Amino acid sequence: ANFTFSPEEVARFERDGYIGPVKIFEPEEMTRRWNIIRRQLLDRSLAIYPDSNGKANISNYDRHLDIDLLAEHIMRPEIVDRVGSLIGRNLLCWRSEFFPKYQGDEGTDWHQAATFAHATGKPQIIWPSDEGRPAFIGTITVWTAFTHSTEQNGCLQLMPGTMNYDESAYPMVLKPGEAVIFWSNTMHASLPHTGSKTDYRMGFAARYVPTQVQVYPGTENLTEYGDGINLEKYGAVLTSGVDEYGHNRIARTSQRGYEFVPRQI
């Protein structure tokens, strides 16, 4: 089995900055997993980030490092083969987080998110660059819908085409198990949640970057990074290929013994 994108799909992604929906799991299967995961998030006995009021804790950052079903999710061929077709087979998953949305939540206007750390403004992602030229800081984001993501639910909004506009709603509705893949900085918006109070939307995002990229650059002798992030037990996960660099903290094994074995095609 292979999930590499076709040359056309890759082209589509290149002009839009995103692509989806793409099936990761069948609806009932994703639901089955989320039913388990939801309870497991409650137990932080082995979470890499300590208790705090920071984003990392409240939005449950990097639980793929302690929850088996999440460890497997970021390793999924359905995800990895597709991301790999975009930025290379030597893939690193440097982060995952949840995106809940509840009744009353307002939408967001069109904007481009950045990969800087909120607490310090430090770049969490740094791509290699030529002399003088600034460094790219984007990261391929795979947003899987654990719950259905509808317009009523406050689903994401993306616009076709690539500060600038060019030669001249768009809701990304998703069923449980489907995902949308996009550059973290792709132009996007989101609708407000106008549904019932029991109808919550849950998205699980896994972010990827090729091995040549530096994760949490500097951080030489740091642990407490901000926003509740503590690098002590942090590690980027090599999901495929090999790592010819070694300049990033790496996690070959999850906090629960789940072994991350790089996929090869």
Technique used: X-ray
Contacts of 240 by beta carbon, 8 Å cutoff, 6+ apart: 80, 84, 89, 90, 91, 262, 263, 264, 265
83-110: b (≥16 Cβ within 10 Å) or e: bbbbbbbbbbbbbbbbbebebebeeeee
Structurally, the chain folds into a number of domains equal to 1
Question: Could you tell me the resolution of this structure in angstroms?
Answer: 2.2
Going from the C-alpha of 189 to that of each of 27, 169, 248, the distances in angstroms are: 25, 9, 32
Q: What dihedral do alpha carbons 242, 243, 244, 248 form, nearest 10°?
A: 180
> What span, in angstroms and rounded, lies between the C-alpha atoms of 104 and 153?
10
Residue 217 is which amino acid? P
Going from the C-alpha of 90 to that of each of 1, 17, 95, 245, the distances in angstroms are: 19, 20, 16, 11
Residue 46 is which amino acid? L
Give the domain CATH number at 197.
2.60.120.620
Pair 106, 192: CB distance under 8 Å: yes
The phi, psi pair for 213, rounded to 5°, reads -85, 140
Token representation of residue 29: 């299967």
Q: Where are the alpha helices (DSSP H) in 88-130?
A: none
> What span, in angstroms and rounded, lies between the C-alpha atoms of 153 and 77?
28
Burial of 128 (C-beta count, 10 Å sphere; 0-12/13-18/19+): exposed
What is the domain extent for residue 263?
1-265
What angle (nearest 5°) sits at the alpha carbon of residue 114, between those of residues 252 and 4?
A: 50
